[PDB]
Every structure is written in structure tokens, then in C-alpha cells.
Subunit: 179 residues, 6 copies
């Protein structure tokens, strides 16, 4: 009756537009936590190799799968840091296309649907431009001292983000059948 | 063998007087976490709509049930913040009667039984009066900017608190039988 | 060279009244009500707040301003980061928050930090999320309630009103402090 | 107006010796041993503590006091919240903590913040939980152990003894610093 | 499919030399959390009775058992605090022999294998001497105000630590068979 | 006695240039770029950093030093604990970090706190873990990138080079500030 956060937590009734999101990393963290797929526990993947910190809460969507064999990642904008392992309701407001070490790794940019400040945003264009620059720079830089290259491209609108999410929902459901 | 914190964690040998308490919210937090009953995970219910913070650690008693269909809530006084999802041993020292949006929602005021500073308190009357005022004001105010009203009444002695706990223990055991 | 009294010896700045130096007294998230000690220029604990509330933003005063209550003009400064009490920064007014505290007028400026890349581009409080304004209003209405003190907060007024209030404080300081 | 040396230029306050201004040097929870630099009035890092220990409460000194060790009288201030080094607050003595540090006497006041709603009503250290007193004693016994320095802490003495010690420091300051 | 952190999390392929470590206590904490063996949850065992804090992250090795019937404890040196309940990969660099209330209770001193600063240490002798003194003093003192005595002896080299770990791995496997 | 301007009125210390007083402006882990206001001696917010980066260590300046850019000599101080802006500590140089910021030279000292038991025993930057040096270099290369400002950081130079740079700043201060 205790849930594995990727398999057992539901994506939520309003998916793909509104979805449960499991936080892995807190805003301001230098610790890169990640879900351990096997156990469903949080593990330290690494300490970041630069004096950088995550600009926002970061995690993944339960019952999603991508071509890299992991759930779909999400950056969640909100007033407050959230603890790793806790889940929240998020609305997608953009897609951030990236290439990490030659491999495609697009990520959702979302807001917390239960944050009174942020829940009213629907589109990444409504954010201050500096914010977007800060996010882009973070992803370009956070693995630089590991001699890894991350290319970050122009963000794409919510309708693209939501298609990405629906596609990962499909890929997950297709993986669950075989098992 | 991994526990759901409401169903699988025992209430403890000394219940109802002394009980295990699962912390949901840390002292000083603006994040209102709560137990997700289905999964047993911690979720963000909301960010508080006012510039207020929880005055003390806050959570629930495992294997308890109230008329609102949730476990019985507890405010736990102690020297240190405790992380959401962690449990501790608590002694009830009072009952705080409230009405939230017309619905009865009484809460226990407790101390941590393993805090050397606080474990020796047996009654809410032993606390400084200002503390009680601060607690009362918090519950009156924390949902005000959501246009919700919470009436908070005079606190009741430990013997009342312990009856409330025993009653929730009964209501839980009665719910578990049907299933 | 001389170490500065932050009220008297810190300049208000070239862009005033529009953009001005601001001395932080209280950090965002604080339950400690620090204030300028006018005699020494040190920061003092006035009180610990009597409720489980915290300052929603950094808060301080404008140097070389005076109000009828004998104090510099108060400012709430929105920006990404907490700032330490006693440090100063450059701020731009985006509104005025009219209040009455224990029957006395006590208007406060709402501003943004002019050197924060995120917030320096705001010019008007109406550009902020509505919730933000509600949180700020509620704070000032609630923060002295458990001291049985009443604060009424009225609708916020535009930047041109803010700027006029700042200019007036500047004149009252010159009249009462600097020139006699 | 003049910016203040916090030892010399900050007044001890109208209620002294009972209630007095206190300058915080070290914040509750800190492993950094800050101290007043007597020459400049700035705060300096004296050392990082040599053990995994932290100050149990805010700690500082009383302005315009002097002890035989050539320093102001030290004070441990109990209250709800951490206070920043360099800020001052109003405190009430509730006891005296007699100690010997490397063979020299070094009594310290134990006090509460007079403007903290929770703690301002305490008048005597015996009103605190026994554990609190044990933690404080252990801290002072342990905090220099890894520097091979010995501190013996004796049983705490009542407020009337505290107040007498404060009055004496006030007199020694007037004698040695103010009047010559 | 959700893991009990002692039973269900693997010790890791490189054990005993490199092992998964479940953090119980964060660097800087006055809260002594510990694993609840029954549930696999984190619980508050006590608030420390002195004004002391853990000098480093602290936890236990999954699928290990000692003569005191608990998993083997580990102090993990790294740049950053880690949250209770999260696991990480650690390399043993020493054994710290202790006697707690007359009972033998040796503990591993390790580094995080994924911390770029610390992963390159192989031996406790490579640490500044003051660090070792600080650690030793912490264990000698942290239970003093509870009138408990902890004797801490000279640290022993990595090869001893690794034998201790292998032995606890054996004791665990021998306990698992009966069940 | 006089309250001190931290650049002018704080002594560099008896052990200089080897060991020197250092005034912290920015705390380890901070995204706020504080700096000394040379006119007042107060700490001011220069900017909030334009990237999601943080200072890797405590950072400040040496009192009674001058560089061609009209500012005291900058210092990065390694130690166990964050230190508050405006406080001073004793530091030992272990290297020099040569940089060019927007085409202008801007060498900075790398040092350790002389009163931190862990770090006071280091004498040379080569004794630090290689990763530590890479993190520091990357910080200075990256921290102004989103302001479209370029900083090139070159290989670090030994303590004897650091010490010479400090001595030179001391002489330039005496020449330009103290003696005229």
C-alpha cells in the first residue's frame, strides 16, 4: 500500500495538462539527487562540479517514459523550496529542448498549480526574460566542469510541452504492458 | 516490508497517552504538506496564502480516523525542526478545539517525548501564555487570504485530548474491519 | 575618512526621488523586527513579532528623509534574495502603501531593487501578481494584531504618488535636520 | 551625527543594571566565535570553534562595562530567534554564571530579551527547564576542550548577584575608561 | 516495488570496498534520526542533550548486521549536507573503534564516491589531523549529558574497515536465511 | 573612541604582507554581490548575480591596500564556515589568481583563515584538491557571463607572488591615500 513514486503514484486526472510531479531536487541545491528506478528511493547522483545551484525545484512525472529510459523531467517554478521525495500538482507552461552529450533531453517548464502566486501563469512568455536566461544558462553550465556539453535551444509553447507529456505517457503505458 | 505511514506504522505501546506522530510540516514552513492517503507519500497541498509560517512541527497520528475521514492532527512542541515524513514519539498535553469552514477540526497539542527540554511538560497550562496566543492566532489566520474562516476555542486539558485520541483509534479500527 | 551614520551620512543618490539608496533593516522571512537606532546609527532589535508571521520582503528606510513621526521614510523592497540588515541598496519606487497605525498615518513605499536583473524592469505595483499585493496588505494588517495594535491598510497608490511622498520627506529632512 | 563604537558610544540604558542594552557578537547556533574588536568597534572572527559544538544562545557584551580582563561584561541572551552579530537589544539579567577559564575568573550574565513576548516575563534562571541549564553549562565546559583549554563552570547565582556584577562593571568602566 | 532501505536496497556491486549508504542524519543536525527497523521509516530517536551537532552526514549500510542487531554505521565526508532517507555511494577510508556504554560500536569513516572534491581520498590519514580530532571529540561528547560514556580509540586503516564491512555483510546474510 | 571605516581605519596587521586582516564582503554560498561602499565604509548590494551561481567561498578585501582600479586588493578566503559581510578575520595568502575582467587586470588573492583549526595549516594553493581550484576558476569565468562581460582566469601563482602583490598594494595605498 506504500507507493513507488514512478510506478504507483498516479499522473493525475488533468494529465497531460496538469500532472503530479515528484520533486527530486530543491531550489538552491548543489546536490543532484535523482530517483533510483529500482527502489523508488532518492539517491545522490553527484555533487555538482561547479559553484552553481538549481534555479528552481526539479523533478519528474510519474508514469512517464522517454527514449533515454527515464521519466520526463520538469522544472517547477514556485515561491518556496520543496523537499526531495514530495510530490505536487504542476501545470506545464513550456518545453525546454536540449541536447546533452549528443542525446536529446527535453524538459518541461511548469508552475505549481497550488502556489497562489504562480498557479495563474499559463505560458513561459509571461515570465520575465531574465528568468529564462538564468534557466538556460544553468542547463548549459551545470555539467561543464565534468567536460560534458549541453546545448539548450529556444523554449517551445505549452501546446508542444503537453504533446511531449502525452507521448511520454504513451511510451510508459507501452512499457508496462510487456511486464 | 516498507510501511504506509498511516496504515503500517503502529500507534505505539503507550497510546493513547504517548503515541507515534508522523510529521507533515516543519516548524517555520510556509509549505503546507500533507499525507496523500492513497500512496502514503507527502504532497504539497498548498503554499500558504499569507506571510505566515507554522509555529511548530505539525503532523498526524498513525492508525487514527476522524469524522472528516483523515487521521487526527497534532502540533508538536520541541527544540528542533523535524523533516516531513519522519515520525517521533509524542505526549499529548492539550486539545485545541476549532471550527474550520463550519466543520469541527480539533487538533492535539503535544510535546516530543524524546526532547530533553520538552519531554517533561504534561499540560498546555505549563506553557507561557504568549505561546498559546501565537498558536491560536496562527490557526485563525493561516487560511484567511483564501477567504476561509477558522474559529479557535479555549484549549482543553490533557484528559480531554487523550479521550479524543482514543476515540480516533476506535474510529480507525472500525474502518479497518470493513476493508 | 569617516564611518557613516546610515540615516545622515549616506546619500539618497543621484536619481532621487525616482531611484534612491535604501538601508535594509529587516530581511525577507524574518520574525525579528530590527530597526535603526536613530541616536547611534546601529541596528537594534525593537521586538520579536508577536505572531507566527514573517516579513514578506526586505524592509528598510531611505537615508536623508524625514516623516512627521520623526523617522525616515519606510520602504518594502522586492527582489530575488534576502539582504542583511545594515546594508544598503538602490531601489526604484513602484507605489505607495497608505496605512494607519494606531490612529497615525504611516505610508510606506513599495519598491524594487534597481540592480536585481529580475525585478529592476518593473515600474508599477500593478505589474505584480494580485496575490503578491494581497499578501503584503495582509502582513501589515496582521503583524501587530497580537500586540492589540490596529493597522488599517488602504489601496496602493501609483508611482507618481510614491515619488511625491519621497520628495516631500527629502524636503522635510533638509528643513528640520540638515538646515537646523 | 556620529556613527557609534558599540562599546563606548552605545548607552547601557535607563533600566541598568536591571535591564540593559546588550550588543550581540555571536548568533544562536553559530560555530564562528566572533568578538568585538575593541580598537575599531568592528566584529572580528576570533576563531572557528575547535569542536563540533555551537553556541546554545545569542551571546554578546554590555556596552560601557569593564572587567578585570580589560573587556566588557559578557551576556548569554535567551529568546525565540537568532540575532545578527553587531545588532543590539534590550536584556534583563536572570542570573550569573560563575566560571574559571585558564585559571582566570570569567563570570557571565544569563539574561532574556526584554522585548521578546515569550521570554521577557522570566525573572530568574531557576524558572528555566533544568535541562536548559545543563546544556549551557556543558557548552562552556566543552567549547575550548580541543584547544587544550580548561573551563570550570560553577552553580549559577541569582539575579541580585547578577545585577551587582553588572553595577560593578559599570563603575569600573566609569573609573578606568570614561573618567581617565 | 517500494523498498525498505535496510532489506531491499542493494549494498552495491563494489561492496565491500564501495557501498550504498542510507543517510539518517545530516551534517550540522542536533536531531538524532535513526532507521526504524520494522517500518523502514526515519524516526526521531532523540534531540541531542548537548549543544553539539553531527560533524558530517551519518547513516548505515543496507544488508549489513552487527552484534548489536543493527546495520553498520557510517560517517560520510562530503561538500554538502544530505537529507535523511536518501542514499549515496560511499568508499570506506577508515574504521573508528568505539565502546559505547561498555558495548563495542565500531563505525566506518567514508567519503562520497560521487563528490568531486572528496571522492579521491582513500585513507583517513589523508585528512587534516584537526578533522579527526573533531570527529573523535564529537563521539566522546554527544551523549555525555545523558550520563553515558563513549570511549573512542585510534582510527584503523581502510583494510580493517573493509573487513568489518564484509563481516557485517556475512552476519546479515546469515540472519536472512533463518527468516 | 572612533568607529572605523573598514578600508582606512582597520589595520592590515602585524604579519602583513604574509598574514593580514581581511574584511568579508560576500559570504560563501551567496548570490548577492555585496561590496564596500568606499565613500561611507558601508556594505552595499552591487547586484544580484545574473546566473544561478554562488560564491564558492567567503570573499572580501584587505584594508589599507590599493590597486590601479582604485579599490583595495580582493581576497577569496577558504575556511570551514560562512562569515557575515562587514566582519573581519585574519588570513594567510596561499596564492594569487591572475584574471582579466573586461580587458582590465584584476588579480585576486587566494587565502585561508589563519584562525580556522582545519585550514590554518595550508601554505600553498597546490595543497588543495585539484577539483577545488577548477571550481574556483570556473566561478570567476562564469559569474558575469549573463551580463555579457568576459573574465579570463589564468593559472594560479605561488604564495611568494601573492605576497609581493600584497606588499605592492600596501605601498600604493601609502603613496596615494595615506600620504596624499
Amino acid at each position: 500500500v506504500a507507493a513507488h513514486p514512478w510506478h504507483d503514484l498516479e499522473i493525475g486526472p488533468g494529465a497531460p495538462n496538469i500532472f503530479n510531479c515528484v520533486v527530486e531536487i530543491t531550489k538552491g541545491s548543489k546536490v543532484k539527487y535523482e530517483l533510483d528506478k529500482k527502489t523508488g528511493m532518492i539517491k545522490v547522483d553527484r555533487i555538482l562540479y561547479s559553484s552553481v545551484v538549481y534555479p528552481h525545484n526539479y523533478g519528474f512525472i510519474p508514469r512517464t517514459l522517454c527514449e533515454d529510459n527515464d521519466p520526463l523531467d520538469v522544472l517547477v517554478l514556485m515561491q518556496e523550496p520543496v523537499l526531495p521525495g514530495c510530490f505536487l500538482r504542476a501545470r506545464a507552461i513550456g518545453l525546454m529542448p536540449m541536447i546533452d552529450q549528443g542525446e536529446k533531453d527535453d524538459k518541461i517548464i511548469a508552475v505549481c498549480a497550488d502556489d497562489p502566486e504562480y498557479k495563474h501563469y499559463t505560458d513561459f512568455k509571461e515570465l520575465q526574460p531574465h528568468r529564462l536566461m538564468e534557466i538556460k544558462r544553468f542547463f548549459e553550465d551545470y555539467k561543464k566542469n565534468e567536460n560534458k556539453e549541453v546545448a539548450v535551444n529556444e523554449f517551445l509553447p505549452p501546446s508542444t510541452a503537453v504533446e511531449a507529456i502525452q507521448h511520454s505517457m504513451d511510451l510508459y503505458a507501452e512499457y508496462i504492458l510487456h511486464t
